[PDB]
Design a protein around this ligand. Structure first.
Ligand SMILES: CCCC[C@@]12CCC(=O)C(Br)=C1c1ccc(O)cc1C2
Ligand SMILES: CCCC[C@@]12CCC(=O)C(Br)=C1c1ccc(O)cc1C2
Lengths: 225, 225
């Protein structure tokens, strides 16, 4: 109830944000990168557990959602981290990248998908409160199977609340009702792009390094046991 | 101007809908399927040329948009065609499929992504006017590169108009302002799913039949010359 209310929901999400992850280095890009994800994934699962109502869904649903959405959530965080640095990607404190470093490959393709989309978010002037709500939407909207009898009723309620909070945030800008709808529409259309980049990253990842998708699956098990 | 107005824009789109395509048969599924797309693509390009303002964009933009969005537009049409037939996919008049025919493979995965998403549109009670506006959004939102000096100003104007028409359509249902936003949000979140299915179909398609993506590219050239 209360916890799912716009002002509160948004401040609960703020405290649930994952920490800075240091890669901690003593196929090097891809070595750096896969070790990073392994690290980031642990925190991702913690983050999800702090989203009001998520742990009360079915574990059959929790596991489905985290499995399908991990790369879009790590990419959404990445764009938010690089949003002010045109030309770069800020993967972590000691791991920043130039586009011309994405020349050594296949990675260059993905690199430009993430710079472009990020530039789009810059132009829209993505607010923190907006960022927090969209990343939560990405997790809850990541699959359709899990919302095809109570956990479903629950999943929708919890997804509708987040959409309510975003709408709320936007209404506070003091813009016109038409601007509101145009902004809500521009924001959610951008998720289609996010998913695209995710699909490509996932693709690149099987054509190959650390067992990110393995261990995660493993983390998913312990998460159940 | 006028042509981009909600009631009119929606009736212009109605007359621009492609015809019934008969496959016309005298790797058979995939033979049927690739021949079908070759056929459907010709009409797709005609359809796009009837969307007010599209031919006045740069050809550098026209070609980018059709190239990136062809499979999502053929899948969006497919779901609309099967929306009332649970368990099937209605690819064309003489080409209907059962899920258990999608067992002979890899195609089964995709098959369930398209049944699920379609079921979602059923539950939402997707209206014709709504269908017409979303399919146009899919084409105009298909890439971000082309909207990263006039053709861009133009592209946004033309995408904003379509979003205006959809919003208009939804406001006519006589539902509550909160229902409006929740419905607009539910509709555009579904595009993320559409793109997902597209990405998978595209994937399946290179791992392989008719040169769909070749000839299309070819059609793209003639389209310029
Ligand atoms: C353009 C290269 C992007 C690498 C990105 C996608 C490709 C990949 O294999 C990995 Br493991 C990647 C990754 C790790 C952590 C993170 O937060 C985001 C990503 C995306
Ligand atoms: C589940 C199988 C789907 C086949 C679908 C995606 C896989 C594929 O190779 C082809 Br050519 C396909 C196709 C053709 C026409 C059309 O309107 C839609 C599609 C999607």
């Amino acid at each position: 109830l209360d916890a799912l209310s716009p002002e509160q929901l948004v401040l609960t999400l703020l405290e649930a944000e994952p920490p800075h992850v240091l890669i901690s280095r003593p196929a090097s890009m891809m070595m750096s990168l896969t070790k990073l994800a392994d690290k980031e994934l642990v925190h991702m699962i913690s983050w999800a557990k702090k989203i009001p109502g998520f742990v009360e869904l079915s574990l059959f649903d929790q596991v489905r959602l985290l499995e399908s959405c991990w790369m879009e959530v790590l990419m959404m965080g990445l764009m938010w981290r690089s949003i002010d640095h045109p030309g770069k990607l800020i993967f972590a404190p000691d791991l920043v990248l130039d586009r011309d470093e994405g020349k050594c490959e296949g990675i260059l393709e993905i690199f430009d998908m993430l710079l472009a989309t990020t530039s789009r978010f810059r132009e829209l002037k993505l607010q923190h409160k907006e960022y927090l709500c969209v990343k939560a939407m990405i997790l809850l909207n990541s699959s359709m199977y899990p919302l095809v009898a109570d956990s479903s009723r629950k999943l929708a309620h919890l997804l509708n609340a987040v959409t309510d909070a975003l709408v709320w945030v936007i209404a506070k800008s003091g813009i016109s009702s038409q601007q509101q709808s145009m902004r809500l529409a521009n924001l959610l259309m951008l998720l289609s792009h996010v998913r695209h980049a995710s699909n490509k990253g996932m693709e690149h990842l099987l054509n190959m390094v650390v067992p990110v998708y393995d261990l995660l699956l493993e983390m998913l098990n312990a998460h159940v046991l």
